[PDB]
Amino acid sequence: VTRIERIGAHSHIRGLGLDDALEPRQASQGMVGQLAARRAAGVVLEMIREGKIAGRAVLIAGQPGTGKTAIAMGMAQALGPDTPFTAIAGSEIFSLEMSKTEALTQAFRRSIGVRIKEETEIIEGEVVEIQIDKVGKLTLKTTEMETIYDLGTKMIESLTKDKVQAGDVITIDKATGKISKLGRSFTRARDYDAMGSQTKFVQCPDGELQKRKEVVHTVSLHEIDVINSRTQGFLALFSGDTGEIKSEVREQINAKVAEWREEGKAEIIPGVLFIDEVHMLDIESFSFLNRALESDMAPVLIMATNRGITRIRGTSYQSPHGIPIDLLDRLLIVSTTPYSEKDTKQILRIRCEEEDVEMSEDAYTVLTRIGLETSLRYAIQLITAASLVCRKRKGTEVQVDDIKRVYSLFLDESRSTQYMKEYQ
Amino acid sequence: RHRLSRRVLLEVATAPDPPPRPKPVKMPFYLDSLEEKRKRQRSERLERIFQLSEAHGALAPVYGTEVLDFCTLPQPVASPIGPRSPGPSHPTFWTYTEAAHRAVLFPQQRLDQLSEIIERFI
């Protein structure tokens, strides 16, 4: 057995290790250290799950390999799947069909959920006979009861354009939104050898012909694409919308969603928009966000950048985190302190627990030391590397010698750069 | 709820039932091998139709049909003229003026407008 999602980088992060009082645990739910950072993550998750205010941006910054993306995925996992969580990289907005601003508006609207609920009276039953002279009658059947229905021109045209036949388990509702739902079973082997792709035999319906169906679904506020064109909603399966007509989008979608919120047929549930590596955004997108965060309905933002005093793309200026100060003013920065000798070994042990790479204490110590010297992420690869090297060795526990064997095969960034004295 | 489990299909293979007639008014040649082959191919046939019926309804839509019909507002989303008004009972009729409707020209109305230059300049 093997699923589509095997263990990845952030796979051991199965939640946010905080108590009921948002007190961070030393090691819980896969996360380690980062007490203040994880407490801030939980504080922002609280307002996320609350959903009262809009325009909250929390920036997590630190050295490369301190757990910014780790805390982001932890929040994503601690947050229930019901509320949207749109995680995108800073380079996903540089589209050619969309501008650097419209794609950002779509990403924003994608993180606002709308739990729609609908109720429609459905007449369903196995068709027994269909007569036509124009006027005719319909004999619908169920396992419990039967009844005749008188049709008309509008119904006859729908029964003809949709080639219903005696036995087709039809589904009809007010306004006659008919659906060829399924076919009878008593007409055994209507297809002896070859059957249609859309045909399938199903048992006779139960209960009365008239049944009230309730359908609930969570659609994102980006559903404007559903009415951005004359297509049947399938524009949301590819590029589709590129313009984001402001008039249509705002003055129709927002108003009608507010109306649904009053009728009770829908309810907004704000989510989160996590922009990983946001330092790749240009001053244009930052100045856009400056105003976008000031809108009535806007998800909260989470950013993970490791840039110090660096240049801002599209300009010669330099600012903290490589983004303009006017934007930092509208953020809420959080720290991610580097890990110590203990936290590194702890997260390495946790990562080994994922792929069941049983390691020895000496191997653990040597790997922790190596990771403290070169890098944290590097030590995470040596786990699986030494596991695979020992597997062919006919072993059952990675040893220090097997770790050193791999340490020479896969050299690190530091040593790799040190070996570039030949200069081809 | 009504997935039509396998054995139900095997049972339905029984002889059919007779149709009703409602009019009430009130308040030696035989080959065992051939029969065996026919029975085996009929069993294969029923298994095949069951497989194909189960394989065609296993996928659920991403939105379905009621979701789009719910989100699908009238064809004119923000156009300055209203959609098809079935009558006065719904608010949508008393919202768009005919004068504003004359402000927007459909392509055939542009044809009616330009007929002269269309004829004398193309």
Binding site: E146, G207 | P24
Partner: peptide
């Protein structure tokens, strides 16, 4: 729904007699 079954039972007798 239950009335349908009684009505069918009633129909059976009329057709059986005539």
């Amino acid at each position: 729904a239950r009335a349908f079954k009684i009505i069918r039972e009633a129909y059976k007798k009329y057709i059986t007699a005539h």
